[PDB]
Amino acid sequence: GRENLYFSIPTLRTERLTLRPLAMADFPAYRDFMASPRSTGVGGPYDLPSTWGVFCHDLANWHFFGHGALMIDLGETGECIGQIGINHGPLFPEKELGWLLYEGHEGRGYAAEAAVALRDWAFETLNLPTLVSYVSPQNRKSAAVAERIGGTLDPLAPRSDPEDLVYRYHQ
Length: 171
What we know:
The protein is an alpha+beta fold.
């Protein structure tokens, strides 16, 4: 006669990767990257306050928008090799897909694999009408990844830096 009347951030799996929520343990390697010349292709290097602000933006976007950054781990091993994310808020004119890999992990298709997974998740689960990536015109590596995952340059797209390129993705 009784009745039952009373009733988060994703972890995505790809072929080779686990894309999972940010944790404080991740900050040291992230800061190492962001302080270094390696980061020039994501607008770096950055000072510590700026690095902390981006890391917090990366996590907080989930709460605010239902999308955000995920750390990239290899398989079930827990080895963290970089980050993939979708960004919005006052610093991004449109919802924006970005990625980075730590030193030693390029050339194995990891960035594209992570980007495809989060891109598809956004289009499928969030039903986003579009998605972009902001890429500096000298950044060959990011331009190649963007184009591979189906991005096309959009010269009319808004952007915070007039010298940036904008890749746009669809469907």
